[PDB]
Each structure stands twice: as C-alpha cells, then as structure tokens.
Design a protein around this ligand. Structure first.
Ligand SMILES: [Mg+2]
Ligand SMILES: [Mg+2]
Ligand SMILES: [Mg+2]
Ligand SMILES: [Mg+2]
Ligand SMILES: [Mg+2]
Ligand SMILES: [Mg+2]
Ligand SMILES: [Mg+2]
Ligand SMILES: [Mg+2]
Ligand SMILES: [Mg+2]
Ligand SMILES: [Mg+2]
Ligand SMILES: [Mg+2]
Ligand SMILES: [Mg+2]
Ligand SMILES: [Mg+2]
Ligand SMILES: [Mg+2]
Ligand SMILES: [Mg+2]
Ligand SMILES: [Mg+2]
Ligand SMILES: [Mg+2]
Ligand SMILES: [Mg+2]
Ligand SMILES: [Mg+2]
Ligand SMILES: [Mg+2]
Ligand SMILES: [Mg+2]
Ligand SMILES: [Mg+2]
Ligand SMILES: [Mg+2]
Ligand SMILES: [Mg+2]
Ligand SMILES: [Mn+2]
Ligand SMILES: [Mn+2]
Ligand SMILES: [Mn+2]
Ligand SMILES: [Mn+2]
Ligand SMILES: [Mn+2]
Ligand SMILES: [Mn+2]
Ligand SMILES: [Mn+2]
Ligand SMILES: [Mn+2]
Ligand SMILES: [Mn+2]
Ligand SMILES: [Mn+2]
Ligand SMILES: [Mn+2]
Ligand SMILES: [Mn+2]
Ligand SMILES: [Mn+2]
Ligand SMILES: [Mn+2]
Ligand SMILES: [Mn+2]
Ligand SMILES: [Mn+2]
Ligand SMILES: [Mn+2]
Ligand SMILES: [Mn+2]
Ligand SMILES: [Mn+2]
Ligand SMILES: [Mn+2]
Ligand SMILES: [Mn+2]
Ligand SMILES: [Mn+2]
Ligand SMILES: [Mn+2]
Ligand SMILES: [Mn+2]
Ligand SMILES: [Mn+2]
Ligand SMILES: [Mn+2]
Ligand SMILES: [Mn+2]
Ligand SMILES: [Mn+2]
Ligand SMILES: [Mn+2]
Ligand SMILES: [Mn+2]
Ligand SMILES: [Mn+2]
Ligand SMILES: [Mn+2]
Ligand SMILES: [Mn+2]
Ligand SMILES: [Mn+2]
Ligand SMILES: [Mn+2]
Ligand SMILES: [Mn+2]
Ligand SMILES: [Mn+2]
Ligand SMILES: [Mn+2]
Ligand SMILES: [Mn+2]
Ligand SMILES: [Mn+2]
Ligand SMILES: [Mn+2]
Ligand SMILES: [Mn+2]
Ligand SMILES: [Mn+2]
Ligand SMILES: [Mn+2]
Ligand SMILES: [Mn+2]
Ligand SMILES: [Mn+2]
Ligand SMILES: [Mn+2]
Ligand SMILES: [Mn+2]
Ligand SMILES: [Mn+2]
Ligand SMILES: [Mn+2]
Ligand SMILES: [Mn+2]
Ligand SMILES: [Mn+2]
Ligand SMILES: [Mn+2]
Ligand SMILES: [Mn+2]
Ligand SMILES: [Mn+2]
Ligand SMILES: [Mn+2]
Ligand SMILES: [Mn+2]
Ligand SMILES: [Mn+2]
Ligand SMILES: [Mn+2]
Ligand SMILES: [Mn+2]
Ligand SMILES: [Mn+2]
Ligand SMILES: [Mn+2]
Ligand SMILES: [Mn+2]
Lengths: 112, 119, 43, 44
RNA sequence: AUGAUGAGGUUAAUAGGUUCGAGGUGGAAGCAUGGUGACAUGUGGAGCUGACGAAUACUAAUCGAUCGAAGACUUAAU
RNA sequence: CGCGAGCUGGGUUCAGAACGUCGUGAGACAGUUCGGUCCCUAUCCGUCGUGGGCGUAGGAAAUUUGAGAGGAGCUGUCCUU
RNA sequence: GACAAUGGUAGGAGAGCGUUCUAAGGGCGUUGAAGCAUGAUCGUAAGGACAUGUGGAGCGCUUAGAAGUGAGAAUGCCGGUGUGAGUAGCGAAAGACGGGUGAGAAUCCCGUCCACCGAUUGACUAAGGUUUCCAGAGGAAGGCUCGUCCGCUCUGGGUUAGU
RNA sequence: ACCGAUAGUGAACCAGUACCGUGAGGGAAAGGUGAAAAGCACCCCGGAAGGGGAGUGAAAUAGAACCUGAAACCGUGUGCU
RNA sequence: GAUUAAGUUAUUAAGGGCGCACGGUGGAUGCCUUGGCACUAGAAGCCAAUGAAGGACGUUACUAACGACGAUAUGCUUUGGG
C-alpha cells in the first residue's frame, strides 16, 4: 500500500533534522528529492539516503509506480543521547549532549 | 574593495590566485575571492597586452614567481606565458575578458563555491 | 543575569516560529534532468 | 606554575615500597589492613 | 548587523573590466648625456593612480519558480 | 542622602605595618599613618532601534488628511531713539 | 417521629481507608494473573469495582495476626529529562590553488607558490611516561568542525654492547 | 509472619575492581531475549549504520542497547478554538 | 451596477491553546533470582624455617581475563566410587 523506511540512531540531533524534514513533508516525492539535494545542512544527505530507500521498498515490495508517489509523512524522534563533557575554568567540567535522531519517512499511492 | 583577512595577507592571497588561473585557465574558489580577483587578473592581462618592458616590470611587481608551466615540452615562465600567449589571445578582443560561474555551497563550511575561467 | 523563571513550553515554541529555513529557489536543468539553484551553474 | 607531585621512581619506590612498609611495625599493620580489605595491590 | 529602503536585471549602464577624465603624487622605466664617482640634466608636468565623473555590452545580471482579485448581509436613497 | 548586574574606588568596613594614647598583658581607638582581589553570557517587564503575520469586506499602485504624540522654548553686548 | 448540635491552629479523643507479609477458610487464572493504559463507574472521605487495550503467570476475597504501612517541600540522596538555546564557546598564529584518493574533501596524500621560529617552534639527551614507534588495513566512539586522516580501532612487527 | 536489583553485603554482573589520592585511605555503577539460538537463509535502498519485504517463533508491535515498558521530556496528525 | 450612503458582521492562523489519536525517549511498576541477611544443631578453631599468610611470573591447538595446577604446569600416580 503506502510504504515507509527508517534510519535509527542517526548522529545528527533531532532539532536539526526537523528543520529539513519540515521542507520535505507533504511534498510530491520528486520535488522532495530535489529540495533535499539543494538544501545545505547535514540532515540533507541523510534524509536523502532515507527517502531513496523508502522509494525502493515502495517500487520493489508493493509494485507501485514511483512517479505518482507522495511523501505522506516524515519525522524525527528522540533517540538515545551520547553523553560527554567539556572541562571548564577552575576545574569544573560541564556536560555535552550529543543526541540522536530516528528518521522515519512514508511514501504514498491513493487510499488503495 | 573587499577583504578576507589582513591587507598583506589579502595582497599575497590575491597574487597567489591571479598568478595561478593564468597557469590554469580556470579555478574554483569562494565567490568572494573570485570577484576580488577578476579585477586583478584582468589588469594584468591588460598590462601584458601592452607589451613594453615597463609594463613587464609592473606585472612582475605583482605576479608571483616561477611557475614554469610545461606546455608542449618547454617552460614559459608565468609572466612569460602572460605576455606570450594570453596577450596574443586577447589582443583582437577588448578588455573585459574573464568569467565566474556559481558552483553552489561547499560542504565543509557552506561557502559558496564558484569557478572562474578567463575565456 | 540568569532567567528568573523557566521558559514555558508554549512560550518557547512561540519564539521558535521564525526559526524555519527557506525552501530553496530552484530552477530545473534543461535536458540534463537534475536540478539546481537559481542563477547558478548547471553542473 | 609547578603543580605538586613531580614523579620520581626512586622516591616513590623508597618510602612507599614493600620493603619500607616492612621496616616498621606500623607498616606491617598497614599491609595487614590492606590484606584484610583484599586490595589487588598492596604496597606500590 | 540581518532583514528592511533604494538603484538595476538584455527592449539592460547594475557592478567589474575597458577607454577617456577630475583629484592625488611629483619628474617612471629604458635610453642618451656630463661626470673618477656618489649623481645631475634631457627624452617628459613624465609615469603611476582605491572609492570621484563620463562613454562603451567586453564579463556577469541566463533560464525559471512562487505569491496575488472575482468583490457577504441589512436598510434608506436614483 | 536618584543612578556600583552603567564606571570609578580616593574615603570608610578584614588580614601587614608604625606613632601618640590606654591596658601588667594579649591587645585596644576617644585617634593618626603607609599598603591593600569591585564577579555575572539579560530569561521576563521596561527602554532604543528594526522586520514578519493578520487586520483595515475585491485585488493592487502612488499621493495624502492629522485624532493624537514628540522636539524646540535660553541669553549677553553694541548702535539708534 | 419530632427536637437540638456540627468554623478552627497547637493540641486531646474517636472511628475508618489503603499497602506488604502470615493463618485459616472459601475462590479466580494461558478460554489469559499481576502490572500498565483508556473510560461519562460506585462510596460521606481515605478509597472500591467494571469494560476494553496492552501484557504473558501469577493473584484476590473473608476473618484474625504482624508491620521496613501511606511523601510535595528537608539548598534532602540517586536516576532520568527539561529551561535557558540553536544561545556562550570551538584554547595565541597565513594561507592559496593545481593533481590525486574516496560513497563522500576547506581539513588526508602529492606538487608549486606563499608565509612563520631560527640562543629556536631546530638538533641531542636526564627525569618522567610506558607501546604512544613501524607497516597494512579501519572510521561507531575519541579529535571541540570535517575526516579517506591520527598519539583513536583491528591484524602483524619492531629495542641486538667485553669496550 | 528477613531483602528481592535505589532493597539485601561495598560487592546477585571477573569488587575492594573501574575510578580518586604521594600515601594511609576512599570507592562506584552495572542482574532478566526465548521453551528451545531456532539469533532473521534470501531479495532490496545504503560505503556502512539502519531499514522494507521474505522467514524462525505462541508472541520479534519478545530482534539483542532485547520481559513488563509508568511519568517527566520530544515529536506527527488534527475536532473545537 | 451592488451603484451611492449609513450600519452590521465574516473568512484568514504566521503561530498558539484545550481535547483526542499515534509514535519516541526514559526505566518506574508488576513478576523472577543465581546474591545476601539473622539464626538453630553438629565438625572444627589453628598455620609457620620439613619455609607459611599472601603474592609475582608461569602452564594449554588457539589465550586476554578468571579458576585450576605448577618446568612432572589447563596436571602425574595410587587405591575406591562411577
Ligand atoms: Mg556526524
Ligand atoms: Mg573542583
Ligand atoms: Mg572570521
Ligand atoms: Mg635511589
Ligand atoms: Mg629490602
Ligand atoms: Mg530572509
Ligand atoms: Mg552608473
Ligand atoms: Mg566608476
Ligand atoms: Mg560612475
Ligand atoms: Mg463568486
Ligand atoms: Mg587598584
Ligand atoms: Mg604599592
Ligand atoms: Mg576588575
Ligand atoms: Mg487491593
Ligand atoms: Mg478479576
Ligand atoms: Mg557520514
Ligand atoms: Mg627548543
Ligand atoms: Mg567518524
Ligand atoms: Mg592529597
Ligand atoms: Mg460601507
Ligand atoms: Mg479576503
Ligand atoms: Mg489553528
Ligand atoms: Mg478550556
Ligand atoms: Mg538463599
Ligand atoms: Mn586545572
Ligand atoms: Mn607588513
Ligand atoms: Mn514551531
Ligand atoms: Mn583499597
Ligand atoms: Mn615490581
Ligand atoms: Mn572603474
Ligand atoms: Mn660618463
Ligand atoms: Mn548604449
Ligand atoms: Mn524570467
Ligand atoms: Mn468595489
Ligand atoms: Mn443588520
Ligand atoms: Mn545613594
Ligand atoms: Mn580605598
Ligand atoms: Mn587608607
Ligand atoms: Mn574575615
Ligand atoms: Mn605601658
Ligand atoms: Mn509591520
Ligand atoms: Mn481596495
Ligand atoms: Mn508624510
Ligand atoms: Mn495634533
Ligand atoms: Mn513656543
Ligand atoms: Mn469541627
Ligand atoms: Mn456553625
Ligand atoms: Mn490521638
Ligand atoms: Mn504483590
Ligand atoms: Mn480507573
Ligand atoms: Mn479474584
Ligand atoms: Mn517508610
Ligand atoms: Mn522528588
Ligand atoms: Mn540529579
Ligand atoms: Mn541564530
Ligand atoms: Mn552558528
Ligand atoms: Mn539570549
Ligand atoms: Mn548574540
Ligand atoms: Mn559566535
Ligand atoms: Mn584552535
Ligand atoms: Mn585541493
Ligand atoms: Mn574519483
Ligand atoms: Mn602540502
Ligand atoms: Mn622571519
Ligand atoms: Mn633573537
Ligand atoms: Mn626513562
Ligand atoms: Mn599519562
Ligand atoms: Mn604512528
Ligand atoms: Mn567529529
Ligand atoms: Mn526492576
Ligand atoms: Mn592512580
Ligand atoms: Mn533466558
Ligand atoms: Mn548495494
Ligand atoms: Mn543488515
Ligand atoms: Mn509463524
Ligand atoms: Mn532502554
Ligand atoms: Mn518472562
Ligand atoms: Mn521491552
Ligand atoms: Mn508515554
Ligand atoms: Mn497537540
Ligand atoms: Mn504552519
Ligand atoms: Mn499545533
Ligand atoms: Mn566442639
Ligand atoms: Mn624451628
Ligand atoms: Mn600460595
Ligand atoms: Mn593467573
Ligand atoms: Mn580407578
């Protein structure tokens, strides 16, 4: 029916990936690959490889034509954060959160 | 009349660019350096286009050193090429002869890349 | 100076409403079939 | 500025070596206390 | 600051170059000459000149996309 | 005794030190003297600039009226009468 | 049936709700226990049921016993996650392009030019450190960015004295 | 009529260990797939990571950082506003 | 004329709020126990120059860690059990 794919524990933190997806979301799939290829943020190549995979499953596992496909949804969710620190003045050291993003995306046909 | 860094450094970087390009007919850089350097390298090609020893000494006053490009098996110096071919290329032509083409952002810093080729 | 109260969820998101990025201005490469930014090289 | 603890192999081996611990009854009390606790390492 | 304002976007002077010019500096280089020379004079208000002023499409403002009306009800007046 | 998250730090309020004076003393002031660490990335209101959104019963472009608000408001000398 | 009384801090009195364990009795449970979630459910309160979803193996009820028996505050202790905020910061300094390599280069390799210290940023060694040295691979984490690169990772190998 | 992973030993895990201190000395965190490893042959996007099908399984909406999976906190969708 | 006028209202959501659905993070809760804790009854209460306590270094086809053993090393013999 309406196929999806996911990239779990992507190293980029979720606020950023969301800045890109929000451009991507809802658009026709072709347009989306363009916009994705032309935006200059890290999440852009990542989300690119993910939307490609999703189109792949959609052609290959569900026999739909790729052209009429549409990005039904795309979103990033909090995934577990690597926890570090940087040493600071007078011997105190303060935390750094290197957080991660699970990026889902789903493409589409009609209701059936 | 732009910058990137300090004036000496900008002078040097600007020679370093324009001495090149002449070596290599086309280059890839920031849009910014490209705009600043189009004027330099053009003023050089007018200087060679003149041909007199005086102009030669002024060019060599700006142009960076030996870069003896290997042509068809021989070594034209840098300026020696500039007065020697480049000038004989563009003589029937007016001045104004250089172009910049926009590559789009580069990955590491986002800087707008562009290509600058004299033709 | 430090905040005297914590920022509200609703507050913080009202502030963020101008934090989107622009959809790129994007011409279609003729015949090459890719796409690129306006007034840029066709690669 | 020179922070405290400038390492010395001799000075650390003397004064905190198994021997120098053996040399006083108290040092033996020490090795006793550590042996009781089960520290993997006794004297340095 | 960014955005905003404004000047332009080929049916075009918007910037760069180019060619003149104002202003600025003050007599280029090379050569000739006179000196044992350091140098001086001549060729010559010379050469050089960021922003200032003109002319010129030589280079770049290419292709293109997005946004934006169809005009509510009432009552009094032709 | 407006204003030190705007500045100073000379006074005064720490640790050193000395004189006069008091206390046997340790010390002390009704006194004097030389010296002596001024931290903070502005969240809200407030204030100075400066854009977006919708509104303003069609959609725009230029020109506008001015309810209101702000600014300025000082003064000598000399000649004539 | 009439008739009265019922604000309340320190505090006194009284009657209760719920938690875990135990005794006995009576039960429920893979045809789905507890737990968790959702609901317009009942009781004067603490509180009790019920249906659906999840879960997949242990639970209630009755009476009495006994308690590590009830949390919102202690600048409480430990864990997680926010806010500040895409903010402060990215730790003294000149870099430019060409050519490689690669899935991918401002950042790795080569080259050229450029620049920098030169009583030193060079050369040698005592401490001290102990495999960081070398070669081939690698790139999740470490590196304040990137990384094909490394003092990081894997495999292999490196230190020779009569003076 | 003792604890049941913040409890019970500091220690249910290669604990007097990581780690800290010159030293004496101080001292953690960290248990649970399933009945059986049957631990996802194969195809696909991808450099891998990861993922969609195809499969094992009662269950992987039990898939390894693995029983249950609460609340904070982050998100997508929207009925009313 | 919807034209003139006077009046009255609306749509808009950049974003936000309540409700709901669906996810993510995180590891509470329930269930479980290899580990502890307090005791009962009985054995035992010493080891050491015939070199202990406790260690260091070793020992296997591969071997880092732990145990086990020691150049007779991931064991040798012997009498029994199986
Ligand atoms: Mg990354
Ligand atoms: Mg400290
Ligand atoms: Mg800078
Ligand atoms: Mg010694
Ligand atoms: Mg000894
Ligand atoms: Mg903008
Ligand atoms: Mg003009
Ligand atoms: Mg001009
Ligand atoms: Mg002009
Ligand atoms: Mg209509
Ligand atoms: Mg001072
Ligand atoms: Mg002084
Ligand atoms: Mg100061
Ligand atoms: Mg109950
Ligand atoms: Mg029941
Ligand atoms: Mg990458
Ligand atoms: Mg040195
Ligand atoms: Mg990496
Ligand atoms: Mg100490
Ligand atoms: Mg009207
Ligand atoms: Mg409208
Ligand atoms: Mg809305
Ligand atoms: Mg309400
Ligand atoms: Mg037991
Ligand atoms: Mn320090
Ligand atoms: Mn200089
Ligand atoms: Mn938002
Ligand atoms: Mn210890
Ligand atoms: Mn030793
Ligand atoms: Mn000009
Ligand atoms: Mn002469
Ligand atoms: Mn013209
Ligand atoms: Mn056009
Ligand atoms: Mn109208
Ligand atoms: Mn009406
Ligand atoms: Mn005051
Ligand atoms: Mn003072
Ligand atoms: Mn003073
Ligand atoms: Mn004090
Ligand atoms: Mn006296
Ligand atoms: Mn406005
Ligand atoms: Mn109008
Ligand atoms: Mn006006
Ligand atoms: Mn007025
Ligand atoms: Mn007035
Ligand atoms: Mn009462
Ligand atoms: Mn009353
Ligand atoms: Mn009482
Ligand atoms: Mn229970
Ligand atoms: Mn309920
Ligand atoms: Mn029951
Ligand atoms: Mn309690
Ligand atoms: Mn609490
Ligand atoms: Mn905490
Ligand atoms: Mn910003
Ligand atoms: Mn930034
Ligand atoms: Mn701020
Ligand atoms: Mn700032
Ligand atoms: Mn900054
Ligand atoms: Mn640095
Ligand atoms: Mn390069
Ligand atoms: Mn290649
Ligand atoms: Mn190099
Ligand atoms: Mn130098
Ligand atoms: Mn020197
Ligand atoms: Mn050494
Ligand atoms: Mn070290
Ligand atoms: Mn090395
Ligand atoms: Mn990195
Ligand atoms: Mn638990
Ligand atoms: Mn240590
Ligand atoms: Mn198991
Ligand atoms: Mn492939
Ligand atoms: Mn895989
Ligand atoms: Mn099956
Ligand atoms: Mn987890
Ligand atoms: Mn289970
Ligand atoms: Mn789970
Ligand atoms: Mn939840
Ligand atoms: Mn919502
Ligand atoms: Mn929106
Ligand atoms: Mn919303
Ligand atoms: Mn006995
Ligand atoms: Mn003896
Ligand atoms: Mn032993
Ligand atoms: Mn061992
Ligand atoms: Mn036998």
């Amino acid at each position: 029916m309406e196929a999806k794919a996911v990239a779990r524990t992507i190293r980029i933190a979720p606020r950023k990936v969301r800045l890109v997806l929000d451009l991507i979301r809802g658009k026709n799939a072709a347009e989306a690959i363009a916009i994705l290829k032309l935006t200059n943020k890290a999440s852009s190549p990542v989300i690119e490889k993910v939307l490609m995979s999703a189109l792949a499953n959609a052609e290959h596992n569900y026999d739909m034509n790729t052209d009429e496909l549409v990005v039904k949804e795309a979103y990033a969710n909090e995934g577990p954060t690597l926890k570090r620190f940087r040493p600071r003045a007078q011997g105190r050291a303060s935390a750094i959160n290197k957080r991660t993003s699970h990026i889902t995306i789903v493409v589409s046909d009609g209701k059936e | 009349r732009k910058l990137g860094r300090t004036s000496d450094q900008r002078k040097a970087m600007l020679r370093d660019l324009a001495t090149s390009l002449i070596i290599s007919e086309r280059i890839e850089t920031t849009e910014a350096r490209a705009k600043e350097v189009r004027s330099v390298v053009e003023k050089l090609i007018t200087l060679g286009k003149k041909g007199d020893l005086a102009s030669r000494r002024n060019a060599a006053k700006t142009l960076r050193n030996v870069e003896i490009l290997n042509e068809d098996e021989t070594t034209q110096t840098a300026l020696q090429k500039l007065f020697g071919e480049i000038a004989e290329r563009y003589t029937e032509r007016q001045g104004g002869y250089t172009r910049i083409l926009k590559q789009g952002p580069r990955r590491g810093d986002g800087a707008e890349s562009v290509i600058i080729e004299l033709v | 100076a430090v905040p005297k109260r914590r920022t509200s969820k609703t507050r913080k998101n009202k502030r963020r409403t101008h934090f989107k990025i622009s959809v790129p201005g994007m011409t279609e490469c003729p015949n090459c079939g890719r796409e690129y930014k306006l007034s840029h090289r066709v690669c | 500025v020179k922070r405290t603890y400038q390492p010395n192999k001799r000075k650390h081996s003397k004064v905190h070596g198994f021997r120098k611990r053996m040399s006083t009854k108290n040092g033996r009390k020490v090795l006793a206390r550590r042996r009781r606790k089960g520290r993997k390492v006794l004297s340095a």
